[PDB]
Write a protein that binds this ligand. Sequence first.
Ligand code: CA
Length: 352
Amino acid sequence: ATDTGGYAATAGGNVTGAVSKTATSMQDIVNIIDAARLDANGKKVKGGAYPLVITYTGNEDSLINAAAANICGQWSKDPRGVEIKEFTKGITIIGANGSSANFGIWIKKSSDVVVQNMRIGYLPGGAKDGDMIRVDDSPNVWVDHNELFAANHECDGTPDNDTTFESAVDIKGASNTVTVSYNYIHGVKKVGLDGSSSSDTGRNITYHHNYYNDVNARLPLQRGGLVHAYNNLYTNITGSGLNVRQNGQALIENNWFEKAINPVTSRYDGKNFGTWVLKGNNITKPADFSTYSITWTADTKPYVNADSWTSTGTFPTVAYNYSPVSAQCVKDKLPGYAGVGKNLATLTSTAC
Ligand SMILES: [Ca+2]
C-alpha cells in the first residue's frame, strides 16, 4: 500500500475517501486540483480538502513531434507545467495508456504525491526552468513508470550554454524522502539534481529500476544526504553518472553500466568528496572497464573517480524492504518493465 521500494512511503491519492477525476488536458488538471481544495461549504482547506486520483487522458503528441523536429526553438518559449503546491491530502497523477504531455509537473511544499505512467517530452522553456518533474520541499514523493525524454544536445547561443532543455527529475529543498523508479529516461542532457546548491544538502533518495539511455550527466548530481541506487540500467552516459558531492553517501548496487564516461565520480567542487559503497554491479573490478566500455576523464579541479572500483566509504542500514535482481537480469529484462504502458509492472527474480 505504501511500499515504493525506496525511501518514500506513500500511496498518494489511493487512500480512504479518494475522489477519482479524469483530466483530458493540462488545464483540467489545474482545475481539478483547485476544486479539491474546497470543503462542502465552498471554503478552502489548508493542504487540500480530499484525496485525489487524477487519470490524465490527454495527448500532446503533435506538440512533441513538432518540437522534436525543431529542437533549438524550445528553450526560449514559455515553460508549461502543472504546479502541485501545498497539497498534502494525497494525490496521484496517472496517465492513461496512450496519453502524453508536453508540460511538466512541479511539486512544491506538498507531500504524498505519486506521478505514474506519464510520457513527458521535449518541453519548452529550458531557459526558464522548464523541468519535466520538479520535487521541491516535498517528502514522500514517488515518481514511477514514466518516460521522460528530449534530445541529448545543446544548441548554440542558449543562456549559460546549458538551457536547451531543463531536467527530467530535479529534487531540491526539504524533499526528505523520494523514490524514482521504473522510469525510462532518454535523450536528456541534465537528468536531475539532488540538492540545488552546496548548502542545499540532505535528503534520502532511492533510484531503482530506471532505464537511462543517451544522457549526459547528473544521475543524480548529489549534494550530501543518502542515495540508494539499485537495479538501474545505465547505457550511453556521455558526461558523468552519479556525482556524489558535499560528503554525500551512496550505495550503488546491482546496476548494469555500459558505454559510460565517468559512471561514478565526485567532481566540480574540488573538495568535500562524497563516498560510495559498490556491490553487485556488472562491473566488479577495473578489468571490466574495457569489457563494458567505461571511460574516465579528469577534471580541472581535485576530483575522485571510482576508477579503482572500490568502496570509498560506508552506508547506513537501508530502512525499507527491497529485493534486487541480478545486474544481468536488469540488462536482459528491465527495458520491458521501465516506462509507460507496462501496466506498472515490476521486475522480480521470478521473471529473471
Ligand atoms: Ca530545474
